[PDB]
Amino acid sequence: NKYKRIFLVVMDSVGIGEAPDAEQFGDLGSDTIGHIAEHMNGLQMPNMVKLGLGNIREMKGISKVEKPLGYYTKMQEKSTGKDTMTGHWEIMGLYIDTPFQVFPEGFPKELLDELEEKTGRKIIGNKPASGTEILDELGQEQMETGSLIVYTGADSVLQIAAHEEVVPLDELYKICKIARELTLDEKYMVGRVIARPFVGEPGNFTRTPNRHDYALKPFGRTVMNELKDSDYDVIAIGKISDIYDGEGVTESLRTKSNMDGMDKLVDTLNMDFTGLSFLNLVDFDALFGHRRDPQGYGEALQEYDARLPEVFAKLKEDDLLLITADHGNDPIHPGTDHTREYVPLLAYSPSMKEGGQELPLRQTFADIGATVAENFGVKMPEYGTSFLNEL
Ligand SMILES: O=P(O)(O)OC[C@H]1O[C@H](O)[C@H](O)[C@@H]1O
Numbered sequence: 001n002k003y004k005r006i007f008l009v010v011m012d013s014v015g016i017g018e019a020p021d022a023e024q025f026g027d028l029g030s031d032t033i034g035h036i037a038e039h040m041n042g043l044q045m046p047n048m049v050k051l052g053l054g055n056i057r058e059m060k061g062i063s064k065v066e067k068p069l070g071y072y073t074k075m076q077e078k079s080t081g082k083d084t085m086t087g088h089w090e091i092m093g094l095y096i097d098t099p100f101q102v103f104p105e106g107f108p109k110e111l112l113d114e115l116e117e118k119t120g121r122k123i124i125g126n127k128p129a130s131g132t133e134i135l136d137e138l139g140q141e142q143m144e145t146g147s148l149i150v151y152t153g154a155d156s157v158l159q160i161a162a163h164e165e166v167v168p169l170d171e172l173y174k175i176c177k178i179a180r181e182l183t184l185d186e187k188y189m190v191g192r193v194i195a196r197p198f199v200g201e202p203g204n205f206t207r208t209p210n211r212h213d214y215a216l217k218p219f220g221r222t223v224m225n226e227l228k229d230s231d232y233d234v235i236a237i238g239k240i241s242d243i244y245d246g247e248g249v250t251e252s253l254r255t256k257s258n259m260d261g262m263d264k265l266v267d268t269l270n271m272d273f274t275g276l277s278f279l280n281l282v283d284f285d286a287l288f289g290h291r292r293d294p295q296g297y298g299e300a301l302q303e304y305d306a307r308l309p310e311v312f313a314k315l316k317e318d319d320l321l322l323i324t325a326d327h328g329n330d331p332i333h334p335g336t337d338h339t340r341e342y343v344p345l346l347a348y349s350p351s352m353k354e355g356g357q358e359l360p361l362r363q364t365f366a367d368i369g370a371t372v373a374e375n376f377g378v379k380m381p382e383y384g385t386s387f388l389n390e391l
């Protein structure tokens with residue numbers, strides 16, 4: 001192997017400006033990092049700058065450097081959708097024609113009618129809502145009637161809440177499996193069906209640790225599958241295992257925040273493995289992008305940047321660090337949906353003694369998967385062109 005270990009970091013939703021097809025998605029004008037930099041009156045990300053972030057694109061407080069630490073470019077998304085699953089599945093070598101759907105006005109009558117028909121249960125709610133707020137609103141009715149609270153949010157999710165002492169947990173799980181099957185349908189394709197059991201009483205409801213998430217498997221066998229099948233390590237950190245429904249994962253590390261995600265990355269740097277360590281930093285998307293909160297987003301990016309020097313200190317000569325994103329989620333943009341943007345790519349190894357240079361623009365996210373696959377001598381993905389030899 002050229003590299004013994006590859007550390008891949010997805011800064012979730014950290015877009016670097018509207019993609020060529022942004023108009024199709026209602027994303028003209030989008031610019032995640034650039035708009036945040038303007039709001040912050042200059043972002044402070046000196047470590048990303050040292051890697052060559054500004055060499056990709058200059059933004060307020062983010063300037064180019066004469067000798068970037070590693071190689072740099074951006075990537076263009078080829079798949080139809082701008083959701084997390086699409087972005088990640090493409091990154092690991094796939095092409096996804098069918099986009100996952102979001103439901104700002106709730107789910108179509110047709111879908112909920114069939115779910116009622118298959119379960120013998122009534123559905124209430126059917127709207128975007130905070131999980132805790134909707135419990136306050138409808139939890140009592142749910143308890144008295146045995147109906148199901150169905151709701152959604154800014155992401156591609158169908159969530160089903162029911163009181164544990166009214167609807168048995170195993171019945172809630174069965175219902176969610178039925179919903180998961182019904183939503184394998186392009187008309188209502190949801191990324192995730194989530195069981196949301198709760199306990200307590202009106203004015204005092206608590207959601208239990210018995211949450212279960214029902215994901216779809218990637219529409220193809222990924223570079224992660226190939227690594228695992230060839231006996232390499234594939235360490236998933238944060239949402240990564242869930243995003244791929246565990247496909248090709250050899251160890252999974254749960255995280256609670258971006259800072260915790262950087263701690264787990266450091267943990268993997270301390271491990272003797274051969275293969276891939278794959279981190280998703282999800283706070284950017286979950287707390288700041290969808291909430292259209294550029295101040296929180298800017299602070300999170302600065303908190304993340306401050307962690308990088310320890311990562312640089314731990315990387316070995318035969319380690320490669322890859323930093324990218326899976327789409328945009330511009331916190332100064334209409335609505336609450338993701339944005340169709342280019343994503344940054346930074347590629348750094350301490351063995352790059354003269355620093356890096358500009359890579360040709362990546363025409364699909366799958367170029368990352370192809371690079372990983374070629375490095376480890378496993379079956380090349382169908383899509384994507386490796387940049388391994390450029391490094
Ligand atoms: O807490 P809730 O409002 O029920 O659900 C919000 C999100 O919490 C989970 O990460 C899922 O991604 C949901 O979209």
Ligand SMILES: [Mn+2]
Binds near residue numbers: 025027333335337
């Ligand atoms: Mn838009």
Ligand SMILES: [Mn+2]
Binds near residue numbers: 013
């Ligand atoms: Mn994402």
Ligand SMILES: [Mn+2]
Binds near residue numbers: 286
């Ligand atoms: Mn999202």
Ligand SMILES: [Mn+2]
Binds near residue numbers: 295296299
């Ligand atoms: Mn603040």
